[PDB]
Structure 1
Amino acid sequence: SLARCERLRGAALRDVLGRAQGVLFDCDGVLWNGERAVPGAPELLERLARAGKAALFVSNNSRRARPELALRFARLGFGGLRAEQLFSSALCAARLLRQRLPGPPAVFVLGGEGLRAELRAAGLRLAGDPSAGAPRVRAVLVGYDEHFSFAKLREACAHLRDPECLLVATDRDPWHPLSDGSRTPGTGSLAAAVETASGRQALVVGKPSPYMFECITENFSIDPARTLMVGDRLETDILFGHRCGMTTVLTLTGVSRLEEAQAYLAAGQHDLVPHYYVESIADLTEGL
Structure 2
Amino acid sequence: RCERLRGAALRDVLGRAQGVLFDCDGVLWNGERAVPGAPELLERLARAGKAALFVSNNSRRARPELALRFARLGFGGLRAEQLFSSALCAARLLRQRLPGPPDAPGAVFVLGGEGLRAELRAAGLRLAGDPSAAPRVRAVLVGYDEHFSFAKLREACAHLRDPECLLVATDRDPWHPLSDGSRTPGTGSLAAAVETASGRQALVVGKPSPYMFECITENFSIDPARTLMVGDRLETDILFGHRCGMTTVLTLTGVSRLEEAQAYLAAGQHDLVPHYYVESIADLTEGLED
Q: Same fold per TM (> 0.5)?
A: yes
Q: Which digits, 9 at most, give the CA deviation of each residue in 1:29-69, with x for residues without a partner?
A: 00001111011100100110011000000000101101001
Q: Which digits, 9 at most, give the CA deviation of each residue in 1:111-135, with x for residues without a partner?
A: 0000000000000000000000x10
Which secondary structure does the structure 2 equivalent of 1:139 belong to?
A: strand
Within 1, Cα distance between the matches of 2:68 and 2:150?
Answer: 34
Q: Which runs of 5 or more structure 1 residues have no equivalent in the other structure?
A: none
Within 2, Cα distance between the matches of 1:212 and 1:34?
Answer: 24
Within 2, Cα distance between the matches of 1:275 and 1:213?
Answer: 19
- 2:22 alignment partner in structure 1: 25
Q: Which digits, 9 at most, give the CA deviation of each residue in 1:239-269, with x for residues without a partner?
A: 0000000000000000000000000000000
Within 1, Cα distance between the matches of 2:155 and 2:137?
Answer: 11
Which secondary structure does the structure 2 equivalent of 1:148 belong to?
A: coil
RMSD: 0.4
TM-score calculated relative to the size of structure 1: 0.98
Measured after TM superposition, the shift of residue 226 of structure 1 is 0.2
Which secondary structure does the structure 2 equivalent of 1:55 belong to?
A: strand
Q: Which digits, 9 at most, give the CA deviation of each residue in 1:146-203, with x for residues without a partner?
A: 0000000000000000000000000000000000000000000000000000000000
Which secondary structure does the structure 1 equivalent of 2:52 belong to?
A: strand
Q: Which runs of 5 or more structure 2 residues have no equivalent in the other structure?
A: none
Measured after TM superposition, the shift of residue 70 of structure 1 is 1.1
Measured after TM superposition, the shift of residue 222 of structure 1 is 0.8
Number of aligned residue pairs = 284
Measured after TM superposition, the shift of residue 74 of structure 1 is 1.0
Which secondary structure does the structure 2 equivalent of 1:230 belong to?
A: strand
Within 1, Cα distance between the matches of 2:159 and 2:95?
Answer: 19
Measured after TM superposition, the shift of residue 232 of structure 1 is 0.2
Q: Which digits, 9 at most, give the CA deviation of each residue in 1:206-238, with x for residues without a partner?
A: 000000000001111110000000000000000
Measured after TM superposition, the shift of residue 82 of structure 1 is 1.1
User: Displaced runs of 4+ in structure 1, greater than 2 A?
Assistant: none
TM-score calculated relative to the size of structure 2: 0.98
- 1:40 alignment partner in structure 2: 37
- 2:260 alignment partner in structure 1: 260
Within 1, Cα distance between the matches of 2:48 and 2:74?
Answer: 19
Within 2, Cα distance between the matches of 1:174 and 1:44?
Answer: 30
Which secondary structure does the structure 2 equivalent of 1:47 belong to?
A: helix
Alignment of 1:74-223 (within 5 A): 74-105=71-102, 106-132=107-133, 134-223=134-223
